[PDB]
Amino acid sequence: KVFMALANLLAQPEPIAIGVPGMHQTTPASQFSHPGVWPPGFLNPQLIN
Amino acid sequence: KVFMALANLLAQPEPIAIGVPGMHQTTPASQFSHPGVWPPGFLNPQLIN
């Protein structure tokens, strides 16, 4: 919820991958409440360019 | 009617095809009332990945 709060408000400058099809970069961080919907760039920051 | 009622609710998140001709996964459980319309993935769950 912290990580997808900054990643929410920067979507045009910095996009990162969201694994699940229902959620996107501009999805509100209140909804990121399941362990499987964690962004793969948040688990492994090496994945983010 | 029980199987298709769940299958209606997850049309895009579980995008599976139904082998009855002319008919789709957005077809309700009220329609499935004839034995030639039972899905072949319901007949053989090995067709469902």
Place this chain on the structure above:
Amino acid sequence: NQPLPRLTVAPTYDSAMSNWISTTIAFFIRVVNSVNMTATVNDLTRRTMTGVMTAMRQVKTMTPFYIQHMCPTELSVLASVTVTPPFQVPFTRLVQN
């Protein structure tokens, strides 16, 4: 169906409707606890709706015992007291032909 036992511990959960309830709810818990639901459902409400189902799964009810052991030996008697005898066709568990 089966004949009626003495109503002990194991002949109240051995029923096929106890088999049906305790596995449908066990399936519908991992539906709401899946990955795709959280676009609308919250973590509290995933933890709440699970709690509703696992209460519904574990409410002691005797209607599986009735439908397994008591209801046929009532329908067999009530068939012979109606003026119109029961017209009945056979059932089919997913055979399609």
Place this chain on the structure above:
Amino acid sequence: NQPLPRLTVAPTYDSAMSNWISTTIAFFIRVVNSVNMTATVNDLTRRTM
């Protein structure tokens, strides 16, 4: 054109509308920062535009 999604939708930047907007803003951020605008407009209100 893309087909209709049946999932939860969020505003994305991969569309051609967003490709049109975010590249004509990127052109007028160049006109404002161009040499013809440099001598005329004050610098601190040039950053404001």
Place this chain on the structure above:
Amino acid sequence: NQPLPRLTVAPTYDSAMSNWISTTIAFFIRVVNSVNMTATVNDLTRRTM
């Protein structure tokens, strides 16, 4: 965790809480002093932030 201190107590920055504070301030200054925020926000009010 640390054991209960035996001497007179003072506000100090060694703590992991302070390490959480002094590094999340250090990131958000780099948010303010980023290329994605330099061109938008005035230099007189970036250093105010």
Place this chain on the structure above:
Amino acid sequence: GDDGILLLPHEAASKISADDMNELLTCLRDYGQLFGWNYDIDWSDTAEYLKLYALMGCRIPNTSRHP
């Protein structure tokens, strides 16, 4: 002025025994006897600093004070 609030320490403030407080105010009333100071001690667990009142952190406007 003549009146003022006495405060108890935050550790054992509200958990003080009333039998200990009655032995305090007996000694405080006998303390002003060394000066002739008749202390008008009140122990009603309410505030009164300069003719203004309280009850559980709610200011009580004395309507009888301003007729």
Place this chain on the structure above:
Amino acid sequence: VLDPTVLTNAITTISESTTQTISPISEILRLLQPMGNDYAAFWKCIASW
């Protein structure tokens, strides 16, 4: 006999009859029925066998 008070006491521990009333009250709105209905549709369903 058919008495819904056992499951009502079981669903009361997670009831939350206040707000965010979307999901759990819509259950018991069609599940409680103290004076809502008789249990006819159950026995009508046995009699059809």
Place this chain on the structure above:
Amino acid sequence: DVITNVLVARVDPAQRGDAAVDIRATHATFAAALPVDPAAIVVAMLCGQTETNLIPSHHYGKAFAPLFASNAMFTRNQRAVITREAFVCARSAVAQCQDAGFLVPRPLDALRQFDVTSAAAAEIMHAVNDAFKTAFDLDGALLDGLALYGDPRIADLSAAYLQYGGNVVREHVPPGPSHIHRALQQVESTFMAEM
């Protein structure tokens, strides 16, 4: 290892045909949340202060002193013996009227007993609980929520939590060694010889 659910059941999934199925279904989940403002915390976690001459060893020794002079530290300890001995003697009351229930000795098994239903054991365990609270003079919620599901016949208290990677603990609590239950077992043994 994200703790998705914390799971506690009244009925164990053993006598019920319930052991192989998932632990989200075999237990009940603690669904609670506290939406605390981060705006309130930042101007709290970066904002509090103490006085200069404060030493926490002296502060806490003065502070915790009026709350350890009381006897309430020992009250819940001597309710746990009562709660356990209410639980064993009501487990044993149900499992002796049942035929071959839990592993309890059954000295009254020569006596006739027919109605072994769920409401039968409910009218036993509540009759134990009402005759246990009256005997030991307590008005608390002893054994009351244990009959919530409607089945005291199968009642073993268990606790678990399901981590996200399929892991589980399932550390279930058995009852401790009883003393009044073994007295009742001796009273029932000398009953049959001296009816």
Place this chain on the structure above:
Amino acid sequence: TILCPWFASSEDLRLQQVMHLVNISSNTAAALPLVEALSTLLRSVTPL
């Protein structure tokens, strides 16, 4: 020969709390009295 019976074993204390979690409701309105029972004692005896 005093006899002041107070202590339970750790097995007896953990048995009581599971039944205390059984007797409680599982919603957020029943665990809210517990988190504020300790929060009152946290405000009561604190340096901060």
